[PDB]
Amino acid sequence: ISNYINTIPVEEQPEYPGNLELERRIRSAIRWNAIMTVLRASKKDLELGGHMASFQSSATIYDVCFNHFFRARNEQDGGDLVYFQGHISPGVYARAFLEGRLTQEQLDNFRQEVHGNGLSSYPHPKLMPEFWQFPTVSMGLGPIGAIYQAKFLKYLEHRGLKDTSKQTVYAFLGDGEMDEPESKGAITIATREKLDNLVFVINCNLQRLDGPVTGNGKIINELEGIFEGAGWNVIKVMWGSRWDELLRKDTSGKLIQLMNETVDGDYQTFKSKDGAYVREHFFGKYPETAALVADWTDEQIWALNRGGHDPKKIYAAFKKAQETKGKATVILAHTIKGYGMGDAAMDGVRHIRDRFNVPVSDADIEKLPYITFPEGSEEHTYLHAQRQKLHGYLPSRQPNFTEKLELPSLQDFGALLEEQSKEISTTIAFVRALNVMLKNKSIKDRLVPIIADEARTFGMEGLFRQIGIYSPEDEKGQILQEGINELGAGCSWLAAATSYSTNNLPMIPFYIYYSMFGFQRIGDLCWAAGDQQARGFLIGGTSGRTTLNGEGLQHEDGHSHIQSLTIPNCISYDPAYAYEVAVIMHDGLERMYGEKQENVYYYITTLNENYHMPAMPEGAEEGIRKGIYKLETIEGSKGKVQLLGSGSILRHVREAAEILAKDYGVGSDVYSVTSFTELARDGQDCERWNMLHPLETPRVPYIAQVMNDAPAVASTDYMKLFAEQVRTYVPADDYRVLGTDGFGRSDSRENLRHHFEVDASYVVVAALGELAKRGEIDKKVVADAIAKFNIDADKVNPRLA
Amino acid sequence: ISNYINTIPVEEQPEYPGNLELERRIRSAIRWNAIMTVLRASKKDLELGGHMASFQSSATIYDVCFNHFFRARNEQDGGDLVYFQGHISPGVYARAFLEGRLTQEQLDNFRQEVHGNGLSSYPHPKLMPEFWQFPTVSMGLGPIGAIYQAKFLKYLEHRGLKDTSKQTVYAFLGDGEMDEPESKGAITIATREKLDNLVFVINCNLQRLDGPVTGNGKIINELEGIFEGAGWNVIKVMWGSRWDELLRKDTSGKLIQLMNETVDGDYQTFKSKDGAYVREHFFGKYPETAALVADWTDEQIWALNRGGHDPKKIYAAFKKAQETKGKATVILAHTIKGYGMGDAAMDGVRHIRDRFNVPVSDADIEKLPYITFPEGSEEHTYLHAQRQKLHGYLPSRQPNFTEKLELPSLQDFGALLEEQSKEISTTIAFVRALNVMLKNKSIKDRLVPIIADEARTFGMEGLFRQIGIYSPEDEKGQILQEGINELGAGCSWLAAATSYSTNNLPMIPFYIYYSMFGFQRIGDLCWAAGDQQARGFLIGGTSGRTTLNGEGLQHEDGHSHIQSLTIPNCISYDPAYAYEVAVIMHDGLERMYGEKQENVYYYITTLNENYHMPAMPEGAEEGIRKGIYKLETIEGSKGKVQLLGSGSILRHVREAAEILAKDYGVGSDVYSVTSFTELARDGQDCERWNMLHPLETPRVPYIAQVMNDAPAVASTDYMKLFAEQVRTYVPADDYRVLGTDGFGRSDSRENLRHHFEVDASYVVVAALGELAKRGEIDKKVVADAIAKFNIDADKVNPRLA
Ligand SMILES: Cc1ncc(C[n+]2csc(CCOP(=O)(O)OP(=O)(O)O)c2C)c(N)n1
Ligand SMILES: Cc1ncc(C[n+]2csc(CCOP(=O)(O)OP(=O)(O)O)c2C)c(N)n1
Ligand SMILES: [Mg+2]
Ligand SMILES: [Mg+2]
């Protein structure tokens, strides 16, 4: 930790290249429009919300960047990737409006998007696909997302895929936000990877929402200490130009002592007093310091500002940041929250108008008018000139990539569609599918396999010799090894999954990890990924409650699909066979990176259990994609039922079908459900449409088109709701669901499948139970089956176990 | 960073108090039993799994702690809270066995616990309620959990609730694990809070699972750098005693230079070589370093050891941490991953026994026999004597608290059961309920309100003056303000929610935050909380997709209940009225902290929208707890339907009921469903039981004891699945569910409820459609309704919008 003063002394401060007076005129108009937008919204009295205080404290920081640093998307690259702090969006909108990129009607529709011509509260690409790029409002995700975005850009350059050398990633953060574990939890990574293309800009106004970050301390010093300790280049922008003479004249060095010893709480109090209170309680602490401003008027003392408000001090920091190599830079900008709002936190409106000399007359002020700069005016000319010299305007977004990829055909995965000689798993199938992709000339180098330390567990080792591990193991390595860091891996996956838009360079990531540590552990990022229109694959390996049998409670995943189904644009599958994996992966590739360019990403749970992999039935392709297809029909004269299974449990439902036929003469239709969720969604869509078109013939859910009315039983390696979600659409009077509800525990797969009541014996008992209630068989038959199969009818419900 | 040598010089380390030779014998026996336990498991060939290399590298560290530091639960306090590293559990089981706390049958049942007498793969209290205490296998959670556990102990002392001054929180971490953002993301909090009762013990074997943490770097230096920068006291245990002489004689300082410059990857290569190799490649780097061991034999050089394997160096480090005040201490213990096993890292284990001089011939090794010390032996006596001096054995756990609390009665919440004077929200109802509890003499001071910065947003600011904010706003403050850190707040919540077990001091936490940032953002901790038997309340504020209307995409929660239902012991409610909030909170209090002491925690979504709060219907209490009750029946001669709603949408479902009656003559039964999830679980439990007892009287789902067979419509502020989950149990042929599927966006509540097709008009159209289907009304009536209500039947599905 250094002294509580600017890192860059004035004698090392470069000359400011812009027109300070003109830029201030433009900046005031932006401040005004940002405030007008939020105020007009509040007048509606519709609890729309919107902030003003934050942007007022960081406006000048962004202004200097827009005028002298921010590089817009261009022919060579996607320009600088700016992770704008979420709630300062009104300021971004105000500037875009001034630049003529947004209309007054859009500003007037701030926070009213449903009808189409509005603006999102925060940066949401999904809602404004041509404007916003990075979802930052969920605090903490922006800083780590930015770290890996910068790492990914280095990756593209090192891989020889794209020269991203002129791109800088800017993460605009709040000091309170730095408390989120993900904000500083991965900063050492920037040092390990020498991310000199990453700049953290922490707005240090010393306050969070309901108070100071650390009133009894100094968060700027806390931030400096840990970032410095993490190997980052720390640049503190503490005081404005007005303090320079005072510091120079301070021979006793007592002023510096005073600045260092004062805590955030005290500074904040001076922040709400007056020049007299300052010279009295601040400078008046020591005669050396008190004498420094003795010949100063209370108004000249109150004029002393914080560095984050001085364009000159700001410029120096960003210039130094862009020159620095070998490590990432973090700029700690000292600002005043709610700057220039005085009474804040119609007289208030008049105050800001006067405060920033806004060109609005008393006659118009009541109209809460937006300010514009006429073409030909000095402001208009300068505003556009600076941007033009920096390649255009930002933020802006390209929804689709331009190049045409020559994707592998399903036939290219032919081997996976055939019966397998050796017993393998769906994870082995996944790896083989990847290998097929690594042979496709058009996308082989666009593939981005990602692992979180463990590769052997998922049989990814074979890939190492083929494409290697990115380790700028060398700079050309293709696989991203992020270590024990699922969130970090997810962020690399996200950067890769959205490269098609950000860099107009489609990259196809495949991140495989323990399924449990997916949505459950990085769920907020997965939701943000949907918002960011990510197109890639998330592979939940070692999935299924009973399948990762020895690991127990915190590893056995029987619910990730319940978490994944909450994301609108995530398509989830739980294949049982190798050929399904192939079909699903091929379809995903085509949908996301083929002509369609569908904005959706995939989640495929794979297994670590080997078993016989049969050949794909002819014509089953569509059913596999849709989510269900009839595997086969087993004859039986004493009864008829339908059996459904997915994942590792399907082969057990198949065993039950054979038992039912052989021991009870009960026939059955056996279905492989590759996706209960896609089926549920299709069903909901049909019912929704039917409800809205009462005069039309009811549409039929696909699952209802595949199934019949015979009593049905479904068993999965997931909690019952996973299969129960399609109940409404199953055309059968009876539909019993077996599932793995309850906490996992360590044991053999056989013991766990009996414990969770999902194995063959339970499926059989469930099936016989339905046939009994229909009179087709006597109840003693099921009671005898229960005894026969060593089933404990009175063991505690697994959910409670 | 400091030089790559021990922090504590030899002339500064205290005399080792233990019997080195005796301790090694005991340690070797533990090492043996641990290996045997895992080997016998693998023999079964049931893919049970289990690790050995990790415990081998940290075995000595734990041994010194068990012999001289770890305080077991005692009459005065819960003892030291040790977050044992998850996968080294075999070593803990081995010691427990040697202490006579576990039987041979239990060790032989390692990772096979379904039938009872077995052992969990890792620390899982839910599975082993009297043994394990803190779930640490999901890496990254243990370090944050520990930080907040330490802070909570400070809190209990400062609040005058319990003298926890004699307790120390030890977090045993892996170095690879430190890459998880959660691992270092909150370490500055330990400094802010001067957590000198917290000790992080990082096993620095330099390797994660598939490779080194940072092969071309120095992970220990990285760790020292950021922790030191965060204000922690860092103690490096680098080299064993054999190095002291070498370091002392080297007047050139070259050995230190050599140690500093050598990277992790090279040190690891040495480990796989021999004395000659080290002599040449390490000491041979410089003539001065070569000269230090010139008179040494290669064997002597090979004997040079890493500090983390030397009891004297380890002891010195833990003793110094014990003396350090003002902040937390991190011990960086340098170890060898595949320590003993070496070449390994059934008979090949003789190499293990040879190097650790294990008493067992190569004739009985194939038998993989366990080693035990008979009562009276020098080892047995020493083993127990050291533990007795430290108050007993650990880990151990107390499932229930001993004191009886005098909980408030429901009548104490009487004011909340009456009609409210003004329109309020369920969040205001929640705060008023908390106030009732704060008046109860028995639990007032055991309550732990927790917020993450935002308090005013949840109307919590009023409590700030009554009970204050914990700030050691003073050391007596009752409210925990954890800032913008949901994971941290969750960890404080967890520490409080499990104090009843850990300190035999029940504390009742109420953590309120933006519902979206609950399970979605800290879901892995919520799962771990269930495993830890947490008993507390999670309050998801500003919940419901359409209710937090202006916030948009990353704030509008219409799915947290879908995530919460995946946790077996989490009880979730989505109340619409203030009286329901009261009944639910009182019941939760009674269930968790009353005589029942049920191991479950509560999740209650509350709202930021005010509306009329009617009085509770007489006798509706149990129905509220169970999940559903009939509000009223409206007469109608043209038809009859059932209408269900929860949360903020219920009042709109009631509006629909009035419309149907007044405009279409359609009568209805209106139900408030306080918990679709509890109703779903009840139904699942009933059918499970029924199918398991085919000859007995079938149990009827609770929801089927409330609803009838008339066509039904349900609508909530959550995705359709939230209400569709009870389909199988709804005793009606038609059950249409409306929901908020799709990403949120900014607008008025009215526009969002129409966009998400959940408002009164959609409920009406849904109900009429059902009637039209059964010919009770003309299809034209439904079509006409759609037109009248300005419903766009061809609007894109909200899920895809
Ligand atoms: C994960 C998450 N939690 C909580 C919030 C709610 N929130 C909005 S503004 C705010 C405080 C902002 O403080 P800081 O990060 O210091 O930024 P400032 O506005 O002062 O620039 C909070 C907690 C959020 N957006 N995301
Ligand atoms: C969140 C999470 N991700 C992955 C794993 C799988 N895992 C088990 S052991 C291991 C490596 C452990 O390395 P380290 O933390 O360095 O400890 P060591 O075993 O070397 O002492 C991993 C990644 C886990 N337990 N938790
Ligand atoms: Mg701030
Ligand atoms: Mg390690």
Side-chain angles (χ1 to χ4, degrees), chain A residues 19 21-22 25-26 373-385:
Chain A
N19 182 325
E21 174 245 53
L22 184 49
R25 279 189 271 159
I26 296 172
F373 289 128
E375 186 183 302
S377 64
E378 192 166 2
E379 294 87 354
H380 179 281
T381 298
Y382 191 91
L383 173 72
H384 290 290

Side-chain angles (χ1 to χ4, degrees), chain A residues 27 30-31 54-64 308-309:
Chain A
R27 182 164 62 255
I30 296 180
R31 290 175 184 283
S54 188
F55 179 61
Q56 288 312 307
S57 73
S58 60
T60 309
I61 298 175
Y62 285 99
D63 198 52
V64 176
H309 291 290

